Structure formats: structure tokens, C-alpha cells
Design a protein around this ligand. Structure first.
Ligand SMILES: N[C@@H](Cn1c2c(c(=O)[nH]c1=O)CNC2)C(=O)O
Ligand SMILES: N[C@@H](Cn1c2c(c(=O)[nH]c1=O)CNC2)C(=O)O
Ligand SMILES: [Cl-]
Ligand SMILES: [Cl-]
Ligand SMILES: [Cl-]
Ligand SMILES: [Cl-]
Ligand SMILES: [N+]
Ligand SMILES: [N+]
Lengths: 263, 263
């Protein structure tokens, strides 16, 4: 059949996808800006397709309910055919790779610790040994799942702590986790992907810091339904953009070129 | 048909694959040790196959001759059906991904600079602006090809320098590049994968250093012939080993646990 416009699913998460300040004046894909907006355009240019950016209906990345076996989030949109491709800060994981296809990584990352400046914490082990400084994750997604599933002693101890800590240590959004770090006078540390930690460290009021080594070594990938023809071309496009240096330029653009916390 | 023993191709490169000191007493896969030997065993355990380790006949990673269109190295062994899987420090690249399949990365790496301690160089830009300190790469493989193909101004200038520098700045093996750094009194710097640089920095006589940021962000992958059934299972195995923390333990084992240059 004839070519059809490709339906892209993504999520509003700065600096990946944001509504432009003047979005009300605009229409279609032009309403949005960010790293993943630019990445989508570069992939589409290389692969020769037209596309429509859509925002995932349920605000989730992708997990399977143990009872109903239903997949939610952007992964679910692909599984059920509601989108053709997901272009987002979506972690490549085994359980997702069993049900959708991922490109090779377009970013590298790992779980990391965000502190308010001056907090006396340098590592996950430091957090795990104490309770005065509370710590947690998003309430959905791969960071939470890392702790829930870990059999590594330190991380399993951290999960047991997080499940039982009061008040709740989980947050609904990145913005909520960052604000909680900023408002808690050093008594909350936030476990989040290193990419996001690095971005926030260069945002005013310049009161957060990434500390410690990353806890793991993962990647974000572009996702397509299993067996999708688009998958081969998109994978090769990611590799080409990486090899040309364009992914490095794009991260610099959205993370550092307009950093707010000095040179 | 019945299951058959899987033919693995690999390459002798420390610390990935080495003949054991007592190899003459041993036979079969037990003759070898290293990171990729252990990785092969872990993948085979998870996927449930028996295998034979073989050493790539031509000593190469994988490139295509522009005239004959023939693929050499471990990639070629897969393309031509002489091996079933390659388990080695083999970089995921676009041109290889067009002809073979790669798992998701089992290691992350980028091109990096090795100096003799005390050499007044901190970056690729520093190298590119001068000629007193000579610099080069392996004479085959992805590091050389990065420079040959780069359209980035600094790296293209470095390639033009390397092609014309005298005496030749290229080396045949990692051991030769390391020895050249060690023997050249600061007048040779070696461009090599960060993984190898990190390994050598913890080897006696403890006279080399990794300097500067990495020039790129890549991965090593396990390779199979295009469309091979083994590919899906091996990809999921890599993801599982990563998610269990086993790849991190394996790098620590072969890089740092017996490092020779202190704690
Ligand atoms: N990439 C994850 C989702 N996610 C994200 C952040 C995080 O700190 N933790 C997390 O889990 C920050 N941006 C996305 C997934 O794919 O579930
Ligand atoms: N991974 C490369 C081969 N290679 C290697 C090293 C290097 O410094 N440069 C390079 O090119 C060190 N160990 C392998 C490929 O796949 O061609
Ligand atoms: Cl259409
Ligand atoms: Cl927004
Ligand atoms: Cl057999
Ligand atoms: Cl050896
Ligand atoms: N997949
Ligand atoms: N491939």
C-alpha cells in the first residue's frame, strides 16, 4: 500500500519534549521542542517518512500488569498498535525487548543520586546505611523497577527501606522529585536517571548535585512494534546519527549550551 | 534438526581472551581465559547451548574491501557462515549492522588517548594542533576507521596528519601500541578504545594514563549472522546479564580486582 504518516508516541518530560512557550500560536509537530523532538525530525529525515507527534495517553513508559497481562505506557501503545514508534527517554530492558523492538542506544545512562548541595551522601551504600536522609524514586518506570527487582544486597536493602519509609518516598513526576530535593533541606535524596540528573544540575537555582558513580549502565532506545519494518531503518538511522556526532551535539544543545549554572 | 555445537569466533586480545599459562596441559575451551571467555560461558548457560571457541583466522574485526566486496575478520566469518556467533571486543557500527546482527551492548566505550605519564596532552584537540608528540591508531579496526571517515574538523585534521606522518604512526597490535607509548619518552600518544586504555592503566609498570574525554560513545555487541535464530536469545541473555549486575562484576574481575598499580 501507499505510505502513511507514522504515528510517534512520546511523553512531556523536559528537556526531551516540551510545549514551546508560544505553542498556542502554532499547530502540529511545531508546537513541541526538545531533544526527542529534534531526534524524531533527524530520524524522519534520514528514513524518509512523514510523522505526527502524539503524547502517550496514560503518562507511562511501559510495564505489564501481572494480573491482566496488559502493557501500559508507550510500550503498550506499540504492543496494541496505537502508535508506530516511540521516541522518548525509554530504557531498553529485557522484559520490554521481549514484546517490542528497540534500536541500538541513542543515549547511555545509569541510575544516579541527586542531592541538595551540602548533603553528606556520596554513594548508594551511604544512603542504604541510614534513614535520616530519606530517599526514593519515581512511582513508575525503570528506576523504581530496578530497585524492586534487584537481588544485589545494597539495592535490595534500599528497596525494603523505600517500601516501608514514611512519609512516602516516591514521587509522581521528575518535577516533583526535583522540587522535593530542593525544598527538603538535605533530608531527601532522589534516585533518578543520570541524564536527568545532569540536566537539572545545570538549571537554576543551581542547588542540586549528582553524586557517586552510576548504579548501572543502560541505554535509551527508539521502540517499534515487534517485527515492524520501520525498525531496521530506524536502527540504522540511530547508528548513523551517532557516528556523525549528531547525538553528541544534540545532548550538548539541550543540556549544556544554555546551562544556567555557569561555565 | 538436532542441536549442533555452536561455533564461536573470537580473537586473542588481553584481557578478553588469553591462553592460560598452563594451556599446554589443557584442551578445548578450557585452554582460554578472560572476560569474553567468561561471557561466552554465561551466555551459553543462559541460552542452553554447547559451544566451541575458535580464533578468527585472519586476526581482524570486520571490514569490507571496496573492490572485492569481501568481508574480513570475525564479521566475515559470520557473513560467510564459518562461525555462528562472535564474542569479542567488537564494536557495533552501521556498516557491520547492515550485514550481521548485533546484540544490545555488553560494554560501553569510546575512543580515548593513552599517554606516557607526564606527556603534556589533555585532549584530541591538543594532539591535533601539534606534531612533536606523534599519535596514531591500530592499522585495522573501528578506531582507525573512525578517523578515516570523520567529517568532524578536529578528527579529520588528525586523520590527514596520521596518513602523512613519518615514521608511520600506525601499529599492528594493541601490545605494539602500548609498548610504543612506553618506549617513546612522551613522543608517542596512542588512540585506542577506552576499555583497553582503562585495563592497561592498571598494568605494571604503571607508566600510562588515560587523558581527556572520550571522542565518541559506542558499544561492543555479540554478533550473529543476519536473521540467525540464536540472535534473539543471545540479545535477551546480554540484557539479563546486564540487569543482574553480572557484566559489571565481570569487568571489575578482569580490569580492577587484580590491578597492579595500587588501590
Ligand atoms: N527511562 C525510564 C523512565 N524514567 C525516567 C527518569 C527517571 O529518573 N527514571 C525513570 O524510570 C527521568 N526521565 C525518564 C523508563 O523507560 O521507564
Ligand atoms: N573494537 C574494534 C577493534 N579495536 C580494539 C581496540 C582498539 O583500540 N581499537 C579497535 O579498533 C582494543 N581492542 C579492540 C573493532 O570492532 O574494530
Ligand atoms: Cl497518512
Ligand atoms: Cl511542556
Ligand atoms: Cl555438533
Ligand atoms: Cl594469549
Ligand atoms: N525485540
Ligand atoms: N542487523
Amino acid at each position: 500500500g501507499a505510505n502513511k504518516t507514522v504515528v510517534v508516541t512520546t511523553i512531556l518530560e523536559s528537556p526531551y519534549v516540551m510545549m514551546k512557550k508560544n505553542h498556542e500560536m502554532l499547530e502540529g509537530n511545531e508546537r513541541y521542542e526538545g531533544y526527542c523532538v529534534d531526534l524524531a525530525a533527524e530520524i524522519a529525515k534520514h528514513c524518509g517518512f512523514k510523522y505526527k507527534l502524539t503524547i502517550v495517553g496514560d503518562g507511562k513508559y511501559g510495564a505489564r500488569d501481572a494480573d491482566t497481562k496488559i502493557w501500559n505506557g508507550m510500550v503498550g501503545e506499540l504492543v496494541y498498535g496505537k502508535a508506530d514508534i516511540a521516541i522518548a527517554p525509554l530504557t531498553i530492558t529485557l522484559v520490554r525487548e521481549e514484546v517490542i523492538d528497540f534500536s541500538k542506544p541513542f543515549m547511555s545512562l545509569g541510575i544516579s543520586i541527586m542531592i541538595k548541595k551540602g548533603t553528606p551522601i556520596e554513594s548508594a551504600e551511604d544512603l542504604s546505611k541510614q534513614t535520616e536522609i530519606a530517599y526514593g524514586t519515581l512511582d513508575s518506570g525503570s528506576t523504581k523497577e530496578f530497585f524492586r527487582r534487584s537481588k544485589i544486597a545494597v539495592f535490595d536493602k534500599m528497596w525494603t527501606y523505600m517500601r516501608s519509609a514514611e512519609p512516602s518516598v516516591f514521587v509522581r513526576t521528575t518535577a516533583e522529585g526535583v522540587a522535593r530535593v530542593r525544598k527538603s533541606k538535605g533530608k531527601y535524596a532522589y534516585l533518578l536517571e543520570s541524564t536527568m540528573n545532569e540536566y537539572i544540575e545545570q538549571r537554576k537555582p543551581c542547588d542540586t548535585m549528582k553524586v557517586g558513580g552510576n548504579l548501572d549502565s543502560k541505554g535509551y532506545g527508539i521502540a517499534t512494534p515487534k517485527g515492524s519494518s520501520l525498525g531496521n531503518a530506524v536502527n540504522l538511522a540511530v547508528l548513523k546519527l551517532n557516528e556523525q556526532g549528531l547525538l553528541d551535539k544534540l545532548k550538548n544543545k539541550w543540556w549544556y549550551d544554555k546551562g544556567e549554572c555557569g561555565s
